[PDB]
Amino acid sequence: VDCTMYICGDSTECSNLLLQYGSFCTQLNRALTGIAVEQDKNTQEVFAQ
Amino acid sequence: LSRLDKVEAEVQIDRLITGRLQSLQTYVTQQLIRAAEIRASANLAAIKM
C-alpha cells in the first residue's frame, strides 16, 4: 500500500498535513514489505526441500 | 509550556498526547507479535534440544 496515495491521493495539501505525523507511513510500508518477503520464504521452505 | 497560556496550551498538548500514545501503542503491538514469533522459535529450540 502506498500509505500516502491511500490517505491523501493526489493532494499536495493533504500530503503536507500527513508529513506532520512522521514515520507512520514508513512503518506501514515496512510492515507490509516484511509480510510480503515472508510469503516467498514460506514457499521456499515448503517446496525447495 | 514556555509560550502559551493554559487553555490554549491544553489543545496543543492534547495533540501531542494523542500522537505519542498512538506511537506507543503501535510499538507495543508490534512487540507482542515479535514476541510470539520468538516464543515459537524458543519452543522449537526446546524441542530441538
Curated annotation (Swiss-Prot), chain A:
Disulfide bridge partners, by residue number: C3-C25, C8-C14
Function of the protein: Precursor of the fusion protein processed in the biosynthesis of the S protein and the formation of virus particle. Mediates fusion of the virion and cellular membranes by functioning as a class I viral fusion protein. Contains two viral fusion peptides that are unmasked after cleavage. The S2/S2' cleavage occurs during virus entry at the cell membrane by host TMPRSS2 or during endocytosis by host CSTL.
Protein name: Spike protein S2
Organism in which the protein naturally occurs: Severe acute respiratory syndrome coronavirus 2 (2019-nCoV)
Lineage start: Viruses, Riboviria, Orthornavirae, Pisuviricota, Pisoniviricetes
Swiss-Prot record, chain B:
Top-level division of the source organism's lineage: Viruses
Phenotype for S2A: In strain: Alpha/B.1.1.7
Role, per record: Subunit of the fusion protein that is processed upon entry into the host cell. Mediates fusion of the virion and cellular membranes by functioning as a class I viral fusion protein. Contains a viral fusion peptide that is unmasked after S2 cleavage. This cleavage can occur at the cell membrane by host TMPRSS2 or during endocytosis by host CSTL. In either case, this triggers an extensive and irreversible conformational change that leads to fusion of the viral envelope with the cellular cytoplasmic membrane, releasing viral genomic RNA into the host cell cytoplasm.
Name assigned to this protein: Spike protein S2'
Full-sequence portion shown in this chain: 981 to 1029 of 1273
